[PDB]
């Protein structure tokens, strides 16, 4: 029987492709095929993925196009990947990470051809920079769940994924389908380019800010600092005077002179120190 230790290893390219398809087709439950290989009985690499046409309305899965799938597979084999289809992925823009009736039917269709086929659900809307909402699934058998069986084998203690969400539990988790743990492959080579993202050229590194604009910015910021200094004097005065509401209900809806003054000093000091250092380094290097 299947084990409660199966792990779907989604590659960086696969994850990026699912997220791009997600925040390209919204709210349509856009869909694609996950290409990889069942290396063993407990692991499923998903090396790549590729989208499907998404013809017309796509609020529901669209009965994977066999001709498009075949031509994708043949050309990928021609230009690289000789890998079979290990599953299908689709998007749930803000719903969560559950499966609908159509999703369950499509995953039955996938299992019929390959018993190990996985169903990945991404949530491009709920994903944030550092945690991508995504979940792998396979369906529980009505036959076994009526004939008193757990359709997962608990050899390991790897069934602590996230205390599955109430959304999934009410949408049919642990009854008609189960969640498969997901990990990722780190190569330290793609990560170099992902780090090269946000990188600035040495032009920007050494450029000096327009001096007139810098002076105007300093003048303005010091003006707001002056006003916030007046307000800070006012606030510190009537702060110890009374603290029944000072704890939480004396700053809501009203400006905080101390906080804004801290922000202004931080920003202006950063700007001035950076520009001074840039000017000095420039005066020497470009001599």
């Amino acid at each position: 029987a299947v084990d409660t230790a199966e792990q779907v290893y989604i590659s960086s390219l696969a994850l990026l492709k699912m997220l791009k398809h997600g925040r390209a087709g919204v709210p349509m439950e856009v869909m694609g095929l996950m290409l990889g290989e069942f290396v063993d009985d407990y692991t499923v690499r998903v090396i790549d993925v590729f989208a499907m046409p998404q013809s017309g309305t796509g609020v529901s899965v669209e009965a994977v196009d066999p001709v498009f799938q075949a031509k994708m597979l043949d050309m990928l084999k021609q230009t690289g990947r000789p890998e079979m289809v290990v599953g299908w992925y689709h998007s749930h823009p803000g719903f969560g990470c559950w499966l609908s009736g159509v999703d369950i039917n499509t995953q039955q269709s996938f299992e019929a051809l390959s018993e190990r086929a996985v169903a990945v659900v991404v949530d491009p809307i709920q994903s944030v920079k550092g945690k991508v909402v995504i979940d792998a699934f396979r369906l529980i058998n009505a036959n076994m769940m009526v004939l008193g069986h757990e359709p997962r084998q608990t050899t390991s203690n790897l069934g602590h994924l996230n205390k599955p969400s109430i959304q999934a539990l009410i949408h049919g988790l642990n009854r008609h389908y189960y969640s498969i743990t997901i990990n990722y492959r780190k190569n330290e080579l793609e990560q170099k380019m992902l780090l090269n993202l946000h990188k600035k050229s040495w032009m920007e590194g050494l450029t000096l800010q327009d001096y007139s604009e810098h002076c105007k910015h300093n003048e303005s910021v010091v003006k707001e600092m002056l006003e916030l200094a007046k307000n800070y004097n006012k606030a510190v005065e009537e702060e110890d005077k009374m603290t029944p509401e000072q704890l939480a209900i004396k700053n809501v809806g009203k400006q905080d002179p101390k906080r804004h003054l801290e922000e202004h000093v931080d920003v202006l000091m950063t700007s001035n120190i950076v520009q001074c250092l840039a000017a000095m380094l420039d005066t020497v290097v470009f001599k």
């Binding site: 017309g56 309305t57 609020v59 529901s60």
Partner: peptide, 29 residues
């Protein structure tokens, strides 16, 4: 007779396929 029979059946096929395509669509607020 099979010509006309299958022609009418194909017309009804097109109608039913259109009906199912419509059935697979939900409204919007």
């Amino acid at each position: 007779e099979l010509r006309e029979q299958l022609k009418e059946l194909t017309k009804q096929y097109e109608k039913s396929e259109n009906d199912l395509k419509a059935l697979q669509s939900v409204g919007q607020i």
